[PDB]
């Protein structure tokens, strides 16, 4: 049962989400993200730190990143 | 082979360690380890094929990757042995560990690159080739999205649970792997990494060399789990769909299996256990 998608301007840069099982982008660079047993997510720059939501975790990119490009995976 | 609390290490050991390992980088061998990691990272999920991460193989898994890095620094000096970081003792950004000679500090506030130490981007010695983030330099945040590492009480808890693993054996587990591992109860692997911040926040965690020293201590851990616990042993032994068994063998060697890995004293020994 996959989340909602979403799209927003989170500090200035565009986050995306969409049921694919799920993918989040970040300008348009997809970001890979994955879905624990319990229901939270991580993404790959913060595999080690569960977060309620995809929205959450596409968040936690951008404020990971401080305004750098994601690379493609 | 004994691996040392870092804390413990003397200045010639300190000073080949880190020359080894910059080696490593500038032949080109240890981005490859930033990259296995990755990938294991990117494809263990709960609901399927689990090896490396949230699994009952993450002790193995790791022994087993630990050593095949110890082993390529020991190709450059023989000497070499991986030092672990007791994170429940040497708690603070003033622990040696990060001192200009070992590791070097946090990175600055504004981009949180690391400015001291030998893995400073300042070096033109430690390229960030293996990423997500494009940024190309060594980042750290200590205590950052993090106040605290875990306590010596809290690794004691962990210690104190008897199981190794239980179905269904990923992150939602019960049982003492995945509470070293951190998924659930009060989170002593996940957490220091959390702590560190940085690269080794995210799925090239390796990039930031106190990745070895992490996965040393957490690899201590789980030899001193079985001295207390000798009627446990892993789990599980056999037939289980997407996880590793006990006599099963493990990607990406393929030739070993948790089974040849139980015994750390086959391979080497702690300065004290
Ligand atoms: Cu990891
Ligand atoms: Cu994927
Ligand atoms: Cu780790």
Redesign the interface.
Known sequence: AAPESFDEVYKGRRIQGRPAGYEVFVDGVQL?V?????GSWIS???????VPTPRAAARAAVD???G????P? | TVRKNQATLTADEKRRFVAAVLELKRSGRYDEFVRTH?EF??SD???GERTGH?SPSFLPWFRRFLLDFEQALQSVDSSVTLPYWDWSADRTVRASLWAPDFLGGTGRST??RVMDGPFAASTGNWPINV?????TYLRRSLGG?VAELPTRAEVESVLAISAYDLP?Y???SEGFRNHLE??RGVNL???V??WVGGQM?????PNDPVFWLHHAYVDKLWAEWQRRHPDSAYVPTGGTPDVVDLNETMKPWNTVRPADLLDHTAYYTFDAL
């Open positions: 890979h994955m879905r624990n047993a319990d790959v720059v913060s595999h080690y730190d569960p990971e990143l401080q750098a490009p994601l690379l995976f | 990755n990272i990117m999920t709960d609901s949230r981009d949180g990423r997500v983030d494009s940024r999205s269904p990923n992150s939602a951190g998924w692997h996940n957490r990494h959390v926040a995210t799925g090239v965690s």
